[PDB]
Swiss-Prot record:
InterPro entries: NAD/GMP_synthase, NAD_synthase, NH(3)-dep_NAD(+)_synth, Rossmann-like_a/b/a_fold. This is NH(3)-dependent NAD(+) synthetase. The lineage of its organism: Bacteria, Pseudomonadati, Pseudomonadota, Gammaproteobacteria, Enterobacterales. PANTHER family: NH 3 /GLUTAMINE-DEPENDENT NAD + SYNTHETASE, NH(3)-DEPENDENT NAD(+) SYNTHETASE. It catalyses: deamido-NAD(+) + NH4(+) + ATP = AMP + diphosphate + NAD(+) + H(+). SUPFAM superfamilies: Adenine nucleotide alpha hydrolases-like (SSF52402). It comes from Escherichia coli (strain K12). The gene is nadE.
Amino acid sequence: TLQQQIIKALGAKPQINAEEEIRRSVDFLKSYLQTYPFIKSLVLGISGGQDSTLAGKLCQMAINELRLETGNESLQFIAVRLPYGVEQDCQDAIAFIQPDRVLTVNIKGAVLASEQALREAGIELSDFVRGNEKARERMKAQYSIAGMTSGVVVGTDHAAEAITGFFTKYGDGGTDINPLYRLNKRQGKQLLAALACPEHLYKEVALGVTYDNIDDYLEGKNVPQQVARTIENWYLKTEHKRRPPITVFDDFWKK
């Protein structure tokens, strides 16, 4: 069936062991850095939300352990705040993560400059498109930081996000390594609880579809048709976001 097909493609499980999933993610990160010693830092955008908070914590843990185990003092996790102009959640998240370094980059300036250039070309942007322009400017900022700190960009993509395709292509979807991929929303909360994360930091979507509906679907449970049909529509429509650029050899988009 289609639902069973999505589950397999995203690697989602009905239930997970928090401790085990924390470990899988941390060792994954550690193993990656050890395989490429020229990499010295992990860069992640901090928004104050559940996903980046969990990802941030896992990154700092990987760096902390590597330092102790290898004595390499130059490794560092860099948390980046990317406000649009102008935040207690961010502050609380940072306090919980305790990153080696925090950078704040205001993207408003760049976005307005891009729009002015477009305006002079005769194109006025809509709020919808502007939202994507922001996500992409944040992607540029993180890659520029990574470019100057021998780092890789860490993403927060996970099962409950990948299924709906609700992320900007080459925006927040533009990353190097995604330690959360396979987990649904509630399972993310589970890991945060096991890490003793402040509660208010992790405790819907659209068209009357809630994360619970999405997670239930991802966990292999039965959900109302109207819900399951909407979820499956989003999936099929956003397949191009989960794949490399289309070439004459692809067929997933045919018919």
